[PDB]
Write a protein that binds this ligand. Structure first.
Ligand SMILES: C[n+]1cn([C@@H]2O[C@H](COP(=O)(O)OP(=O)(O)OP(=O)(O)O)[C@@H](O)[C@H]2O)c2cc(N)[nH]c(=O)c21
Lengths: 12, 188
C-alpha cells in the first residue's frame, strides 16, 4: 500500500 | 554498506496507470478513436507525462483524457467496468476556464495517491470529456452494487474537489448509461 497526500505529490 | 534509497529511488505508486487519449473522428468507431498514450508507476514519471501534455482546457472539443489502472480499458465493456459506474462532475461553459484543469488535476492526484483508502481497489480510473455543451469529469468504479465503496468514494471526491453541500453530484451505472437516455443511483 502506497498512499500520498496532495501536498506531497504537488511537491514533485 | 549500500546507498540510502531515499537519495536516488523514484517514489513508487501503488498502481501502474495508463493515460489514454480520445479524438473524435466521425468516419470511425468510438473504439477506433480511443488510443493509449503512456503508462507510469512513480510520482516522478507521473509529472513527466503531465507536464509535457496539453491541459484539458486546451484540447479540441470532442477529445477526452482517461487515466486508468494498467490492464483496465477506459470503456464500459471492460470486465472491471461492465458492472460498474461513475461519479460524474458536470461543468458549465464558464467552468472550462475556472475549474476544469484544477478539478482534473485533483482527480489524477486522488487516483495516483490512492486517496480512497480501503476502497482503492474499487476505483478503475477517471475520464475528462471536453465538450462544447459542457465539460465532464468522472471517476469510474468497478461495482455499482457496492454501496459502501461507491458512497465512500463520492464523499472523498466531492470534498477533495471542494464542492459545497448545495452542489449535488450523481453516480450512474454504465449499464444505464449504455442502454438508456440521460437517474442517479446515488448522490453526494
Ligand atoms: C465511454 N463510451 C462512450 N461511447 C460512445 O460515445 C458516445 C458519446 O459518449 P461520451 O463521449 O462519453 O459523452 P458525450 O458528452 O460525447 O455525449 P453524451 O451521450 O454524454 O451527450 C456514446 O453515446 C457512445 O456511443 C462508448 C461506446 C462504447 N461501446 N463503450 C464506451 O465505453 C463508450
Amino acid at each position: 500500500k502506497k498512499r500520498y497526500s496532495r501536498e506531497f505529490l504537488l511537491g514533485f | 554498506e549500500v546507498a540510502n534509497p531515499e537519495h536516488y529511488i523514484k517514489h513508487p505508486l501503488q498502481n501502474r496507470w495508463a493515460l489514454w487519449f480520445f479524438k473524435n473522428d466521425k468516419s470511425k468507431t468510438w473504439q477506433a478513436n480511443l488510443r493509449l498514450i503512456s503508462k507510469f508507476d512513480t510520482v516522478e514519471d507521473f509529472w513527466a507525462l503531465y507536464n509535457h501534455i496539453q491541459l484539458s482546457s486546451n484540447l479540441m472539443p470532442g477529445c477526452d483524457y482517461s487515466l486508468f489502472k494498467d490492464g483496465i480499458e477506459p470503456m464500459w465493456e471492460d470486465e472491471k467496468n461492465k458492472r460498474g459506474g461513475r461519479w460524474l462532475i458536470t461543468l458549465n461553459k464558464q467552468q472550462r476556464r475556472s475549474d476544469l484543469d484544477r478539478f482534473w488535476l485533483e482527480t489524477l492526484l486522488c487516483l495516483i495517491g490512492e486517496s480512497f483508502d480501503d476502497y482503492s481497489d474499487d476505483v478503475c480510473g477517471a475520464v475528462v470529456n471536453v465538450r462544447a455543451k459542457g465539460d465532464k469529469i468522472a471517476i469510474w468504479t468497478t461495482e455499482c452494487e457496492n454501496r459502501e465503496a461507491v458512497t465512500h468514494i463520492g464523499r472523498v471526491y466531492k470534498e477533495r474537489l471542494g464542492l459545497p453541500p448545495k452542489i449535488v453530484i450523481g453516480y450512474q451505472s454504465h449499464a444505464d448509461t449504455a442502454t438508456k437516455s440521460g437517474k442517479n443511483r446515488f448522490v453526494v
